[PDB]
Amino acid sequence: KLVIWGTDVNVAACKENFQRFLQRFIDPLAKEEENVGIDITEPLYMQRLGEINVIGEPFLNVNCEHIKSFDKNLYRQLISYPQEVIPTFDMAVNEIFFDRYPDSILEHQIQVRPFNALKTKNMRNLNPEDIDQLITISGMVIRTSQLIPEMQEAFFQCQVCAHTTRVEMDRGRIAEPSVCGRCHTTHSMALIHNRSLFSDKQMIKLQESPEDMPAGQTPHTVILFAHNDLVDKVQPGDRVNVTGIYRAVPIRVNPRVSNVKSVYKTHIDVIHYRKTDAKRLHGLDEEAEQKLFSEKRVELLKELSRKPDIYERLASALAPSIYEHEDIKKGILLQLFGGTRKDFSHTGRGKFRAEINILLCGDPGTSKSQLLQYVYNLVPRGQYTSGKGSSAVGLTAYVMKDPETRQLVLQTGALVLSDNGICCIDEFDKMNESTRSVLHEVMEQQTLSIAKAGIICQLNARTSVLAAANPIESQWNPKKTTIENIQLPHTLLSRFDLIFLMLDPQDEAYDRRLAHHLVALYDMAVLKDYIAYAHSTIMPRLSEEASQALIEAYVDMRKIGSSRGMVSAYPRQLESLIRLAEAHAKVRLSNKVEAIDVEEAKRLHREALKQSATDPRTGIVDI
Amino acid sequence: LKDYALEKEKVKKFLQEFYQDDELGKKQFKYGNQLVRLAHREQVALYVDLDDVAEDDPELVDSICENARRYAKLFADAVQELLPQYKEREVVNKDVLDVYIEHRLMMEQRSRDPGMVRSPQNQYPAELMRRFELYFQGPSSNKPRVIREVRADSVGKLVTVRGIVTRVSEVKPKMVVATYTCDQCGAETYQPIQSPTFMPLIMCPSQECQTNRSGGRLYLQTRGSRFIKFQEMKMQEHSDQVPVGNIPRSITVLVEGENTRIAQPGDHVSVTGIFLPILRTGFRQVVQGLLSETYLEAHRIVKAASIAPEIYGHEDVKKALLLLLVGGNICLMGDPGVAKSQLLSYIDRLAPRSQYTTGRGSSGVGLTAAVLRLTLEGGALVLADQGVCCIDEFDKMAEADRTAIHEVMEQQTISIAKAGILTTLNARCSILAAANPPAALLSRFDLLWLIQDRPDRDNDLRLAQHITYVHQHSRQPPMKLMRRYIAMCREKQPMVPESLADYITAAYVEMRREAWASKDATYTSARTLLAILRLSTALARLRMVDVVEKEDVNEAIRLMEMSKD
DNA sequence: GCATGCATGCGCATGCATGCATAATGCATGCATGCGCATGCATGC
Ligand SMILES: Nc1ncnc2c1ncn2[C@@H]1O[C@H](COP(=O)(O)OP(=O)(O)O)[C@@H](O)[C@H]1O
Ligand SMILES: [Mg+2]
Ligand SMILES: [Zn+2]
Ligand SMILES: [Zn+2]
């Protein structure tokens, strides 16, 4: 037929168009930054098919904007009627693959998966005109249910003469034969489920992160259905991009009747997943794969690491719009790198906290809140809590029951979603003792234990904490000591790796510089790649020199902190020193920790608490 | 009773007739232009005024008022019949639904001979091919009614109501006509829907399936179906119309395609609607017979200078309030007896988006948000997004509320993590607070105004004279313009030049030096400089100047000095 | 002001009175007409 009913799509024309485009397309703007591992002077998609033949992956990913660049009619027809277009694309690709690479072994033929449809619109702006069309989503996963088996081909057996048949599902309904095929008995055919064929299904709930937000809009929850290999490709807390079709389903009046409601439900059928983002750091998914084809970038970063000032440069490049507080930014960078994740299960000690927890104590008239906001917006898997707004049960996990299905026994809280991430706590003073009780175990054991009615479980909460606090009077009164000003139990304070006592010196140079900077307010990719490479390619280790330096630092710290009025020292500070030294070793791209790293860690530890200016026998900071 | 054909012809001639009104000062064929736009997809809904019809025939208007639904259907059919006449060209660009409509009309022309007999079931449903909606505007002579007094006498009539919005439903598609395809034929079956629930069909009524007696079975399709935009609204009475000792009553409204996304929770709205019942089947009741539930179907929803001239004095505070309204957090502490609450009330009334809280009555769930049968509904802080919020008796609030308010002021977002709720809410609102006689207010807020009642004889006598004048003549001694002026002002965004920085820098340094000289001073920090810059930008916006000037900086400095003193 | 007690409050299970859904077959009676009988009328011789 020339056209399909209700559409303008021609099958043969689109097939030829796609086959030609798979050989013709070339784009000059896509440099080696994203045309990764491919000869740019050659056609791109044919090279992709060749790489598929090399590896044997039965799936190919296609960017929509490339097709739109080639022509607009194909783009519009793919967006409008995906059902009439994608199956043509599958066979168009398969014919080319089998012609160019005959007798290549595959378990099943090639399926094409579009991605990156340009839509920057709020989901509430969707209209019935867009039903059954291809859309994109950027969000975070919060709930994933168990797999559901759904039938595709039924198996029937004759109860009288053991004759067996198979019936393929058509239009979503199975028609079982009412008469046998060898004894002609009526209604002798019985259905056997285990002999049939099934497919996987999963339901996902996602939280929207729209670019455009109207006035007074509450957050949104989106229901997604994932099938086959797309199952288990995302985990709660992950920030992903999704490409899929927009659907509508009627709802029954009640489960025992077949009547349906007039007002329809809605959901989105996922077709494609993406993890890359141009604003936030790389996730752990891509780090666990050998995708560093950019040997140019590898060489550039390895040459940069040998330069002496790169450390400071990183502290300069972490935040352009933030002030002269270089020590804070260095501490945040060392937090980003993190310590080595050693394995101590054979020892029986348990898990050892390899991450960095930092505290910033100061007056409200400072920039600690902006630092927390920047760290939240910069790192993936980030969470932000503020004061009494959260409860003890709000963190960890809580008991629930599904509003759509019968039960969902447990649902994760803020801390678990932050697993392998960063949690920023603000107004730490106002938090009650009930939540601090949870924090006590979270901050050290990296695990949570929950024991309630019919629910006994242990969860992983491997997070890193950035806490902000205020003086009790909202002023740093110099007559009172540091401990009296902070007013926190020593058990909670001891677990913080670094404590930054923000103080106002009222220096004229500071005033001039800050005023000039603030009034004047009227490579990120290189940093991202370097951080990912260092975080995923090197395991720090230390020699005896670092060991003895650490021991000397520990005894010196114990001598200094013995005097009352100042924050006393504990054995956990030794482990904090070890973690900071390992992070500094990671910064230099060194597998060996040198005495320079230990000395730098000691310097940061001394400077953060301002113990040099502080009077050792009165506990009062001086200038 | 009158025949519908005559009135349909009258409707057609009324649509074809009027030439009168034009905005640019001429005589323009308005309904002809509307119909021409309706011919293609350049307009997808049409609103008809019942004041314009009143010129030639009032009995039509009365019959429309008492029997609104039938007349709506008649108007729709008349306009659909008129559409082919005014059509002049084919669609330049069309979407999926138009593709179905064109294809169906083309094959109808292909197959159906003019002489063959066609069964009444063989025709297309009227609303399936139609793609335009008709709505009515309430008569100006008709007086808006009260929610309490609409009763069984008003079922089926056309009414106009005014109320306050409290609940809004998210947009979801609603079925209009369902499309079925047979298992063994190329025919298409259409099922209209006029019930809250319906039962999908099974067998095919197509002629070929009947002749062959094949027993083909129908399947639903979503592409061929027609869907409309549907919303549900909850309204309440104004506090003015409630009788003595009673409680405001509520009503439910349903909203259609283009009227969707007009109203937001907390808004005051005027609704032109039809009052219709719903037949209820469910739990058994005491009294036999046919009972029903009432609901309203909407067709149209409609939503320096002197600040509080009644209050004497506080001129500088009024200037600061003006700047806060215009924009780039203000706290007032005062002795009892000085009208601080009335200023907050005036601010709430003046602002387009505003909320006013009195204390523990709105504490807790009244702020932040909560989950209700599931949908998340916000509190006062959420409603006042991109507006101005007003809080009275700030010191008496619970600590949790104060922490939430501090978070809103500094971070501008709320975070909730409790059993069942895990969200971040956007609150881009500026806060005005009132209190009675702390470092938290000085450190967090931008401007503090301390109102001390010094018993000066002249000031007290003038205040007494002003109050006597107000109480006697009911007017101060000798808002729409103010709202329009603020709206025009906020459109622009001035910028800070490079040179003035030095001057500003110098001032800041000197100010801090003075603050360091006066050991009794309490707070100076970069936040004060930011507040000064924001005030200067607001003043420059008031002058509509592209570049910040010196007078704005001087006035901001003077205002901060006056507040601190 | 911080630590503790606690009257209020909410969601899903079972128990129990009312209420709802289902659903052809066999036997009897009056109208039409055959078959045997006796009376009676009409027609021959
Ligand atoms: N400057 C003023 N001009 C006119 N009326 C005033 C003035 N100050 C106070 N009042 C009157 O005094 C009353 C003050 O009460 P209120 O504003 O409720 O006090 P507060 O807000 O401190 O609780 C108001 O009713 C107001 O009419
Ligand atoms: Mg008051
Ligand atoms: Zn058989
Ligand atoms: Zn059919």
The rounded distance, in Å, linking the Cα atoms of A78 and A121 is 19
B41 contacts B91 by C-beta, under 8 angstroms: yes
Q: Distance from the CA of B470 to the center of ligand 1, in angstroms?
A: 13
Q: Which two tokens stand for residue B342?
A: 């009335």
Q: CB B155: neighbour CB atoms within 10 A?
A: 13
What amino acid is encoded at A351 in this protein? Answer: K
- For residue B427, give the nearest of B411, B409, B445, B412 by alpha carbon: B412
A259 with B197: Cβ contact below 8 A: yes
* Expt. technique: cryo-EM
In sequence order, what are the residues at sequence separation of 6 or more whose Cβ sits closer than 8 angstroms to the Cβ of residue B416?
A389, A390, A394, B368, B369, B422, B423, B424, B425
B314 contacts B342 by C-beta, under 8 angstroms: no
In sequence order, what are the residues at sequence separation of 6 or more whose Cβ sits closer than 8 angstroms to the Cβ of residue A9?
A3, A77, A81, A84, A85
Buried b (16+ CB within 10 A) or exposed e, B167-176: ebeebbbbbb
Q: Distance from the CA of B485 to the center of ligand 2, in angstroms?
A: 29
Beta bridge pairs of residue A303: none
Nearest ligand (C-alpha, residue B335): 1
Contact list, A389 vs chain B (CB under 8 Å): 368, 400, 403-404, 407, 414-417
Q: CB B543: neighbour CB atoms within 10 A?
A: 14
- For residue A359, give the nearest of A422, A428, A415 by alpha carbon: A428
Task: Find residues 200-229 of chain B whose CB sits inside 8 Å of chain A.
Answer: 200, 219, 222-224, 227-229
The rounded distance, in Å, linking the Cα atoms of A261 and B172 is 12
Phi then psi dihedrals of residue A338, to 5 deg:
75, 155
Measure Cα distances from A209 to A141, A240, A348 in Å: 11, 10, 43
- For residue A234, give the nearest of A208, A210, A206 by alpha carbon: A206
Q: What angle do CA B236, B240, B246 make, to 5 degrees?
A: 70
Torsion of CA B41, B42, B45, B50, to 10 degrees: -140
The rounded distance, in Å, linking the Cα atoms of B431 and B438 is 18
Phi then psi dihedrals of residue B152, to 5 deg:
-60, -30
Pair type for strands A358-361 and A498-501: parallel
The rounded distance, in Å, linking the Cα atoms of A396 and A394 is 7
Quickly list DSSP for A44-80: HHHHHHHHHHHH--SEEEEEHHHHHHH-HHHHHHHHH
A478 contacts A620 by C-beta, under 8 angstroms: yes
The rounded distance, in Å, linking the Cα atoms of A212 and B66 is 44
The rounded distance, in Å, linking the Cα atoms of A465 and A338 is 12
What is the DSSP secondary structure assignment for residue A179, as one 8-state letter? B
What amino acid is encoded at A291 in this protein? Answer: K
Work out whether the CA dihedral A218, A220, A221, A223 comes out positive or negative: positive
The rounded distance, in Å, linking the Cα atoms of A241 and A137 is 6
In chain A, residues 410 through 449 whose Cβ sits under 7 angstroms from any atom of nucleic acid strand C: 432-433
- For residue B442, give the nearest of B507, B514, B521, B552 by alpha carbon: B521
Q: Which two tokens stand for residue B492?
A: 């622009």
The answer to whether the CB of B530 is under 6 A from ligand 1 is: no
How many DSSP H helices and E strands does chain A contain?
19, 21
The rounded distance, in Å, linking the Cα atoms of A549 and A596 is 10
B277 contacts B294 by C-beta, under 8 angstroms: yes
Measure Cα distances from A622 to A470, A612, B522 in Å: 19, 9, 19
What is the DSSP secondary structure assignment for residue B170, as one 8-state letter? P
Buried b (16+ CB within 10 A) or exposed e, B460-492: eeeeeebeeeeeeeeeeeeeeeeeeebeebeee
- For residue A242, give the nearest of A209, A199, A196 by alpha carbon: A209
Q: Return the biggest CA–CA distance within chain A.
A: 104
Provide the 3-class DSSP secondary structure of residue A296. Answer: helix
A474 with B495: Cβ contact below 8 A: no
Measure Cα distances from B61 to A150, B17, B55, B138 in Å: 58, 17, 10, 10
- For residue A553, give the nearest of A497, A595, A500 by alpha carbon: A595
- How distant is C1' of C23 from CA of B105, in Å? 49
B267 contacts B167 by C-beta, under 8 angstroms: no
Q: What angle do CA A138, A139, A144 make, to 5 degrees?
A: 130
The rounded distance, in Å, linking the Cα atoms of A495 and A404 is 42
Helix axes B315-326, B526-543, angle to 10 degrees: 80
Tell me the shortest Cα–Cα distance from B76 to chain A, in angstroms: 21
B382 contacts B425 by C-beta, under 8 angstroms: yes
Beta bridge pairs of residue B495: B547
Provide the 3-class DSSP secondary structure of residue B166. Answer: strand
What amino acid is encoded at B279 in this protein? Answer: L
- Residue written as token pair 């409204």: B253
The rounded distance, in Å, linking the Cα atoms of A283 and B524 is 42
Q: Which atom of ligand 1 lies closest to the CA of B342?
A: 17
A394 with B196: Cβ contact below 8 A: no
Strands, E, within A300-366: which ranges?
Answer: 358-361
A28 contacts A44 by C-beta, under 8 angstroms: no
Q: Which two tokens stand for residue A314?
A: 């990183």
What is the DSSP secondary structure assignment for residue A540, as one 8-state letter? -
The rounded distance, in Å, linking the Cα atoms of B188 and B208 is 12
The rounded distance, in Å, linking the Cα atoms of A219 and A77 is 33
B396 contacts B359 by C-beta, under 8 angstroms: yes
The rounded distance, in Å, linking the Cα atoms of B60 and B78 is 15
B228 contacts B254 by C-beta, under 8 angstroms: no
Which long-range CB contacts under 8 A does A94-101 form with residues at least 24 apart? A95/A19, A96/A19, A96/A22, A96/A23, A96/A49, A97/A49, A97/A52, A97/A53, A100/A49, A100/A50, A100/A53, A101/A50, A101/A53
H or E element: which one contains A567?
Answer: none
The answer to whether the CB of B312 is under 6 A from ligand 1 is: yes
The rounded distance, in Å, linking the Cα atoms of B357 and B362 is 6
The rounded distance, in Å, linking the Cα atoms of A222 and A204 is 8
The rounded distance, in Å, linking the Cα atoms of B495 and B533 is 11
Q: Distance from the CA of B542 to the center of ligand 1, in angstroms?
A: 30
Q: CB A26: neighbour CB atoms within 10 A?
A: 13
Q: Which two tokens stand for residue B328?
A: 């780039």
H helical segments located in A81-182: 82-100
Strands, E, within B145-218: which ranges?
Answer: 158-168, 172-181, 188-192, 197-198
Residues in chain B: 565
Q: Which two tokens stand for residue A24?
A: 């013709």
Quickly list DSSP for A401-438: --SSSS-EEEEE-HHHHTTTSEEEEE-TTTS-HHHHHH
- How distant is C1' of C42 from CA of A543, in Å? 161
Instruction: State the resolution, in angstroms.
Output: 3.1
Q: Which two tokens stand for residue B495?
A: 């910028």
Q: Whose CA is nearest to atom 10 of ligand 1?
A: B339
Contact list, A7 vs chain B (CB under 8 Å): 96, 99
B257 contacts B133 by C-beta, under 8 angstroms: yes
- For residue B531, give the nearest of B559, B510, B495, B509 by alpha carbon: B559
H or E element: which one contains A144?
Answer: strand A134-144
- For residue B129, give the nearest of B105, B163, B107 by alpha carbon: B105
Q: What angle do CA A432, A436, A439 make, to 5 degrees?
A: 150
Work out whether the CA dihedral B185, B188, B192, B197 comes out positive or negative: positive
What is the DSSP secondary structure assignment for residue A212, as one 8-state letter? S
The rounded distance, in Å, linking the Cα atoms of A422 and A417 is 10
Does the annotation list B353 as a binding residue? no
A474 contacts B440 by C-beta, under 8 angstroms: yes
Nearest ligand (C-alpha, residue A159): 3
A410 contacts A455 by C-beta, under 8 angstroms: yes
- For residue A590, give the nearest of A333, A336, A286, A340 by alpha carbon: A340
| CB-count exposure of residue B437 (10 Å: 0-12, 13-18, 19+) | exposed
Quickly list DSSP for A248-292: EE--BSSTT---EESB-EEEEEEEEEE---SSS---HHHHTS---
Whether residue B517 lies within 8 A of chain A, CB to CB, comes out as no
B299 contacts B276 by C-beta, under 8 angstroms: no
Nearest ligand (C-alpha, residue B210): 4
Work out whether the CA dihedral A60, A64, A65, A71 comes out positive or negative: positive
Q: CB B89: neighbour CB atoms within 10 A?
A: 7
B100 with A6: Cβ contact below 8 A: yes
H or E element: which one contains B516?
Answer: helix B498-517
Which long-range CB contacts under 8 A does A317-324 form with residues at least 24 apart? A317/A527, A318/A527, A319/A371, A319/A374, A321/A521, A322/A367, A322/A370, A322/A371, A322/A374, A323/A367, A323/A514, A323/A517, A324/A510, A324/A513, A324/A514
Q: Count of alpha carbons within 13 Å of A473, Cβ hemisphere only?
A: 11
B96 with A129: Cβ contact below 8 A: yes
Q: Return the biggest CA–CA distance within chain B.
A: 105
Q: CB B118: neighbour CB atoms within 10 A?
A: 9
Strands, E, within A159-218: which ranges?
Answer: 164-168, 189-208
The rounded distance, in Å, linking the Cα atoms of B429 and B353 is 9
Beta bridge pairs of residue B188: B181
Helix axes A82-100, A11-24, angle to 10 degrees: 50
B246 contacts B210 by C-beta, under 8 angstroms: no
Provide the 3-class DSSP secondary structure of residue B390. Answer: strand
The rounded distance, in Å, linking the Cα atoms of B315 and B559 is 11
H or E element: which one contains A3?
Answer: none
Q: Is the CB of A401 under 7 A from strand C?
A: yes
Measure Cα distances from A296 to A32, A34, A36, A537, B353 in Å: 9, 13, 11, 17, 55
Does the annotation list B215 as a binding residue? no
Binding site, annotated residues of A for ATP: 323, 349, 368-369, 470, 495, 572, 575
B227 contacts B128 by C-beta, under 8 angstroms: no
What amino acid is encoded at A148 in this protein? Answer: I
Nucleotides in chain C with any atom closer than 7 Å to protein CB = 3, 11-13, 19-20
Q: Distance from the CA of B452 to the center of ligand 1, in angstroms?
A: 13
Measure Cα distances from B217 to A58, A283, B204, B268, B339 in Å: 37, 51, 6, 51, 76
In sequence order, what are the residues at sequence separation of 6 or more whose Cβ sits closer than 8 angstroms to the Cβ of residue A33?
A294, A525
**Residue B299 C-alpha from the chain's centroid:** 15
A403 with B374: Cβ contact below 8 A: yes
